[PDB]
Amino acid sequence: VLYVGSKTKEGVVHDVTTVAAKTKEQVTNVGGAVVTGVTAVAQKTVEGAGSIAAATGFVKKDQL
Amino acid sequence: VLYVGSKTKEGVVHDVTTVAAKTKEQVTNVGGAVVTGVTAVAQKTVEGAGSIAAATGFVKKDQL
Amino acid sequence: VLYVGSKTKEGVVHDVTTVAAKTKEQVTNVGGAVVTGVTAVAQKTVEGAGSIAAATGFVKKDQL
């Protein structure tokens, strides 16, 4: 009766490897979003109306 | 009666490898989104109306 | 009756490795968001309406 229960991985980010030698960036930003990098987001549950989950480089401008 | 239960991987991101030598970027952004990088998003559940999940380089402008 | 219960990993970020040699950045930002770095976000639950979870490089300007 071994492992009668779970042995799982839910919403998992592992063994992410990155090797970026050079980024000679002249980044000019005027009222905007710029994303230059490793972004790991692991979630199990997100709920609600109008909800944003794991947004990267986002620009939200509502005339509401 | 081994492994009578689960041994699973649900919503998993693993063994992602990246090797980017050079990006001599002259990134000019005026009121917008730019994304230059590794983005790993692992989720199990997202719910709700009007919900955004795992958005990357997003621009939302509503006249509502 | 071994492991009758859980042995799990829920909302986990592990074994993230990054090697970035040089970023000779001339980052100019005027009223905006810039993100240059390792960002690991592990969550199990986020709830609510209008909620933002794990936002990176975000710009929110509402005319509401």
Q: DSSP states of B8-40 as a string? A: -EEEEEEEEEEEEEE-----EEESSEEE-S-EE
Rg of chain B over CA atoms, in angstroms? Answer: 19
Cβ distance A28 to B27 less than 8 Å, yes or no, reads yes
Which DSSP symbol is given to C42?
E
Residue B63 to chain C, least CA–CA distance (Å): 10
Q: Which experimental method was this entry solved with?
A: cryo-EM
What is the C-alpha to C-alpha distance for residues B51 and B45, in angstroms, rounded to an integer?
12
B neighbours by CB contacts (3+ pairs under 8 Å): A, C
Are the C-beta atoms of residues C2 and B1 closer than 8 Å to each other? no
Please count the residue pairs, one from chain A and one from chain C, whose beta carbons lie less than 8 angstroms apart. 249
Enumerate chain C positions whose Cβ falls within 8 A of a Cβ in B.
Answer: 10, 32, 49, 57
- Report the SS3 class of residue A59: strand
Kindly compute the dihedral angle of the four CA atoms of residues A39, C46, A10, C37, in this order, to the nearest 10 degrees: 10
Kindly report the CA angle at C34 between C32 and C39, in degrees rounded to 5?
A: 140
Which of C40, C51, C6, B52 is CA-nearest to residue A12? C40
Q: What angle do CA B30, B40, A47 make, to 5 degrees?
A: 90
Give how far B50 is from chain A: nearest CA, Å: 5
In units of Å, what resolution does this entry have?
A: 3.4
Residues in contact with B33: Cβ distance below 8 Å, sequence separation at least 6, in sequence order: A32, A33, A34, A57, A58, A59, B57, B58, B59, C57
Chain C residue with Cα closest to A30: C30
Q: Mapped to the 3 state alphabet, what secondary structure does A1-54 carry?
A: CCCCCCCCEEEEEEEEEEEEEECCCCCEEECCEEECCCEEEECCEECCCCCEEC
Q: Which of A17, A21, A29 sits opposite B21 (nearest CB)?
A: A21
